[PDB]
Amino acid sequence: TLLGTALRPAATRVMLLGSGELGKEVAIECQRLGVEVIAVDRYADAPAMHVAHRSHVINMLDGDALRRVVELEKPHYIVPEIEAIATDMLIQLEEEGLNVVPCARATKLTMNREGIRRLAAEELQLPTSTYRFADSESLFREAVADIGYPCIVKPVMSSSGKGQTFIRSAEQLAQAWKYAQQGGRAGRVIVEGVVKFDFEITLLTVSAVDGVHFCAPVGHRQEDGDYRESWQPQQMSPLALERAQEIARKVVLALGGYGLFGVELFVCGDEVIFSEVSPRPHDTGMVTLISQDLSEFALHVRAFLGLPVGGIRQYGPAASAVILPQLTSQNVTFDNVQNAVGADLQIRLFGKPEIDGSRRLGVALATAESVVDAIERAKHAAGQVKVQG
Amino acid sequence: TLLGTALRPAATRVMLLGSGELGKEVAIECQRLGVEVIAVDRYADAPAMHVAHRSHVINMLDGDALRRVVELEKPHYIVPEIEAIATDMLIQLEEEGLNVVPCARATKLTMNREGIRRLAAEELQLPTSTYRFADSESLFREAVADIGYPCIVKPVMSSSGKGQTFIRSAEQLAQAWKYAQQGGRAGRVIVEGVVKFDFEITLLTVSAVDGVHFCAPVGHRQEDGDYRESWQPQQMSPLALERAQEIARKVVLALGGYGLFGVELFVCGDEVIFSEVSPRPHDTGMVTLISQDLSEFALHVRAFLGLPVGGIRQYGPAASAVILPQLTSQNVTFDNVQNAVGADLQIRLFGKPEIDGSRRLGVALATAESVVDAIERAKHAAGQVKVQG
Numbered sequence: 001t002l003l004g005t006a007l008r009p010a011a012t013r014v015m016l017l018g019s020g021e022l023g024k025e026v027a028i029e030c031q032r033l034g035v036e037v038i039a040v041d042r043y044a045d046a047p048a049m050h051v052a053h054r055s056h057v058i059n060m061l062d063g064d065a066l067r068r069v070v071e072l073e074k075p076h077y078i079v080p081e082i083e084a085i086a087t088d089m090l091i092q093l094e095e096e097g098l099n100v101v102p103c104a105r106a107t108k109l110t111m112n113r114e115g116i117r118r119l120a121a122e123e124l125q126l127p128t129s130t131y132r133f134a135d136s137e138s139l140f141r142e143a144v145a146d147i148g149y150p151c152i153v154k155p156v157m158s159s160s161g162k163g164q165t166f167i168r169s170a171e172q173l174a175q176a177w178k179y180a181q182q183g184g185r186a187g188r189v190i191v192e193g194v195v196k197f198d199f200e201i202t203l204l205t206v207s208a209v210d211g212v213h214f215c216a217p218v219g220h221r222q223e224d225g226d227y228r229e230s231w232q233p234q235q236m237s238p239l240a241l242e243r244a245q246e247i248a249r250k251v252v253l254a255l256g257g258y259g260l261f262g263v264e265l266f267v268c269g270d271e272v273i274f275s276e277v278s279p280r281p282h283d284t285g286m287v288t289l290i291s292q293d294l295s296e297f298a299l300h301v302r303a304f305l306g307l308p309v310g311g312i313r314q315y316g317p318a319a320s321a322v323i324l325p326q327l328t329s330q331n332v333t334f335d336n337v338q339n340a341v342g343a344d345l346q347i348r349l350f351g352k353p354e355i356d357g358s359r360r361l362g363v364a365l366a367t368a369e370s371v372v373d374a375i376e377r378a379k380h381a382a383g384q385v386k387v388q389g
Numbered sequence: 390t391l392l393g394t395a396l397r398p399a400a401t402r403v404m405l406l407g408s409g410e411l412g413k414e415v416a417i418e419c420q421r422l423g424v425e426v427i428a429v430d431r432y433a434d435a436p437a438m439h440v441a442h443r444s445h446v447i448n449m450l451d452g453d454a455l456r457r458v459v460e461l462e463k464p465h466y467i468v469p470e471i472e473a474i475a476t477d478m479l480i481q482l483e484e485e486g487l488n489v490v491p492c493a494r495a496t497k498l499t500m501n502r503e504g505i506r507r508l509a510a511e512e513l514q515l516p517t518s519t520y521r522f523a524d525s526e527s528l529f530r531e532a533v534a535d536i537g538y539p540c541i542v543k544p545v546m547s548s549s550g551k552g553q554t555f556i557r558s559a560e561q562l563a564q565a566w567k568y569a570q571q572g573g574r575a576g577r578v579i580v581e582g583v584v585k586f587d588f589e590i591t592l593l594t595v596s597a598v599d600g601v602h603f604c605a606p607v608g609h610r611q612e613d614g615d616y617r618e619s620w621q622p623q624q625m626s627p628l629a630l631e632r633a634q635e636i637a638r639k640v641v642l643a644l645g646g647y648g649l650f651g652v653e654l655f656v657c658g659d660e661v662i663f664s665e666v667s668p669r670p671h672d673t674g675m676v677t678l679i680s681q682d683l684s685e686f687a688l689h690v691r692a693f694l695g696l697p698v699g700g701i702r703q704y705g706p707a708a709s710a711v712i713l714p715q716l717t718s719q720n721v722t723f724d725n726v727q728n729a730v731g732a733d734l735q736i737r738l739f740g741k742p743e744i745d746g747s748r749r750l751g752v753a754l755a756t757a758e759s760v761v762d763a764i765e766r767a768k769h770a771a772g773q774v775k776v777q778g
């Protein structure tokens with residue numbers, strides 16, 4: 001493996017499609033290796049753009065627009081950071097010789113729940129919640145009837161819980177369906193039976209030249225479609241961990257290509273159930289910014305560049321807690337920062353240009369002798385931040 | 390501490406005066422907090438510029454040029470990254486209300502080994518090398534006589550050994566007095582009477598809102614005026630450590646201002662002698678990119694922003710080894726990178742635009758069960774990298 005010098009003729013060029021907080025760290029890790037970074041998104045001054053050599057704002061769902069920016073910048077690697085990309089064009093491009101991380105098929109399969117769900121459950125025979133898809137209200141209604149209550153309805157093309165409803169009674173059916181319509185390419189939906197898990201985890205799995213490597217299990221807590229806190233390591237029985245690893249390995253290998261994947265799993269004792277997978281760094285993995293020698297961002301980079309992982313070091317109990325304020329502003333400020341960092345406590349503020357409602361603008365990170373204590377220290381610190389606009 | 394959002398009207402702005410590998414990390418740290426970074430250097434595409442919001446190429450020795458850039462960008466913090474800057478302008482600027490990190494006086498004082506040596510020795514009353522001050526070949530001649538063999542000859546405006554001479558013999562004096570003029574402005578000198586130390590350390594000392602904290606001592610190996618390898622923690626006596634810390638505190642507190650300082654000391658048994666100090670992150674300190682929770686750069690930023698440090702966690706034996714090729718090229722590439730990364734091993738490639746002679750293009754970082762082992766791992770890795778032109 002050979003790397004060039006960013007900005008020079010033989011530069012190794014990486015193009016990020018999506019410039020949120022996740023890509024910002026991928027960008028930093030690229031920059032740490034003198035890798036040239038082109039950050040693209042649907043809006044200007046996106047996080048990853050702050051730390052990139054050059055940025056472009058285009059409609060990433062427009063295959064022609066994508067083709068255009070790619071032809072323009074001639075990246076060696078196209079690193080999708082969000083789901084909402086013109087995957088069909090990535091496949092084209094990949095065929096035309098471009099390297100899509102981890103691979104274009106991985107991106108296509110995961111951007112639509114139907115693809116990844118059917119692959120995992122039907123082709124890989126992995127355990128998942130029960131599910132049905134529906135593309136009309138009536139079909140949706142039949143689906144619910146067959147699935148039972150409670151059940152969760154989600155659009156097949158969504159993230160961070162947009163257009164999703166936890167359905168407890170037929171009473172919600174109409175609202176649920178409309179709402180699932182508002183969320184979505186606005187479309188088809190998935191109706192899943194509710195898994196009553198003991199806890200849920202994210203198994204950050206790196207597929208690299210030297211094999212499949214696993215980060216220690218990251219536990220996470222979700223609320224109202226948003227991850228609130230994550231921690232590592234999440235304790236699991238030996239049997240559960242081994243089962244989780246098995247599932248994760250099968251998934252990443254099936255999707256193909258080098259990179260770090262966020263394998264979302266539900267744990268019921270010693271039993272593990274597959275939920276979904278990010279074929280790229282995962283939000284919950286932001287805890288690895290404090291908990292490992294190589295963050296999930298650093299690992300994604302390492303793997304995609306074709307270099308060996310070797311191993312991953314875990315420094316002990318740690319957690320992340322989101323900074324998710326709710327306001328409307330185009331000039332956001334953060335005060336009381338002196339009460340948000342200190343010993344074994346840090347924060348990250350994304351640089352997002354504005355907010356109009358709820359938005360993840362930063363994250364607090366902490367370490368401690370237990371995840372319980374780390375979680376509290378991180379939440380507390382996130383809380384101390386006085387967000388104003 | 391109130392921080393704005395980079396690129397937004399209330400953004401908090403940091404201007405780096407010097408954009409090499411040290412400032413690159415400082416920049417990355419600022420970015421992580423959504424701080425707006427302006428990277429200034431005397432050449433284009435300097436490392437820190439790759440990761441800054443914007444840059445400026447100017448002669449930083451030109452005060453009028455410095456004022457212009459400062460006033461144009463209106464930074465909240467001026468962060469010196471190299472010695473060669475117009476310290477007078479800093480002083481003036483500071484007087485005009487500008488925040489200079491750690492303080493303008495600190496920058497001036499350290500530029501001059503005259504001012505700093507006197508302060509430390511006379512004023513602070515700390516142990517240093519022997520010395521005096523010549524201002525002529527005759528003034529030079531007489532002094533070196535007062536010091537004796539062997540001894541050191543340094544321009545009071547020298548760095549990296551720029552203009553220095555190790556004198557064991559009178560014959561040299563023909564040379565030395567000349568060389569002392571080769572370098573610096575191109576002059577006046579300082580003659581030191583060498584100290585036979587067991588080993589040398591850099592005591593990275595952070596002065597912040599919650600007082601002064603210290604990183605574990607960093608040992609290093611110098612060669613031809615360039616550090617080659619650095620390691621942490623350097624084994625020493627608690628007594629030696631205690632003494633080192635006392636000297637460091639005294640110095641930093643006397644220099645004034647918040648920031649990370651690199652205190653250079655000689656260790657002979659339980660005795661410690663102050664050599665010099667950088668009022669900014671120090672090269673040898675690059676080991677902290679892998680050995681601690683907060684790197685020296687993260688500490689620098691934390692401190693200058695008025696935030697508390699609280700503590701510094703050290704992850705065990707670690708080392709840095711420089712990637713210091715010597716060639717002439719404007720399109721450097723790095724091959725065999727796969728043999729330079731792995732478990733507990735990483736590399737940084739700076740992004741320097743070209744090279745023409747010997748130049749530090751990157752660094753290898755490693756951790757291990759022992760300091761010795763760490764150094765070997767880091768050295769080996771740096772050695773595997775094939776630098777092409």
Ligand SMILES: Nc1ncnc2c1ncn2[C@@H]1O[C@H](COP(=O)(O)OP(=O)(O)NP(=O)(O)O)[C@@H](O)[C@H]1O
Nearest residue numbers: 129152158159160161162192193194195200222276
């Ligand atoms: N079938 C299910 N049973 C139980 N809980 C579920 C189920 N599906 C989703 N959840 C819960 O809802 C959270 C969000 O679900 P998810 O399917 O990941 O939504 P998303 O919109 O894809 N979000 P993101 O992870 O940002 O892509 C999960 O982490 C669980 O806490």
Ligand SMILES: Nc1ncnc2c1ncn2[C@@H]1O[C@H](COP(=O)(O)OP(=O)(O)NP(=O)(O)O)[C@@H](O)[C@H]1O
Nearest residue numbers: 518541547548549550551581582583584589611665
């Ligand atoms: N009195 C002295 N005794 C022994 N070694 C010395 C002495 N002064 C300098 N050195 C050695 O010289 C190295 C570099 O010299 P130094 O005094 O730091 O000058 P410099 O030109 O300012 N270099 P730099 O460290 O980059 O600022 C040190 O790290 C020591 O190994």
Ligand SMILES: NCC(=O)N[C@@H]1O[C@H](COP(=O)([O-])[O-])[C@@H](O)[C@H]1O
Nearest residue numbers: 018019020021022023160283359360
């Ligand atoms: N679970 C998905 C996720 O965490 N995505 C992250 O959020 C960004 C969008 O946030 P935004 O909606 O605030 O612009 C994405 O770009 C990605 O980094």
Ligand SMILES: NCC(=O)N[C@@H]1O[C@H](COP(=O)([O-])[O-])[C@@H](O)[C@H]1O
Nearest residue numbers: 407408409410411412471672748749
């Ligand atoms: N020992 C001091 C030191 O390490 N300084 C670092 O090297 C730069 C200059 O490198 P360059 O000479 O290759 O431009 C400086 O800007 C600083 O980052």
Ligand SMILES: [Mg+2]
Nearest residue numbers: 158159160276
């Ligand atoms: Mg999802």
Ligand SMILES: [Mg+2]
Nearest residue numbers: 160264275276
């Ligand atoms: Mg999810």
Ligand SMILES: [Mg+2]
Nearest residue numbers: 548665666667
């Ligand atoms: Mg110096």
Ligand SMILES: [Mg+2]
Nearest residue numbers: 549653664665
């Ligand atoms: Mg020195």
Ligand code: NA
Nearest residue numbers: 100102103257
């Ligand atoms: Na690929």
Ligand code: NA
Nearest residue numbers: 489490491492
């Ligand atoms: Na100051």
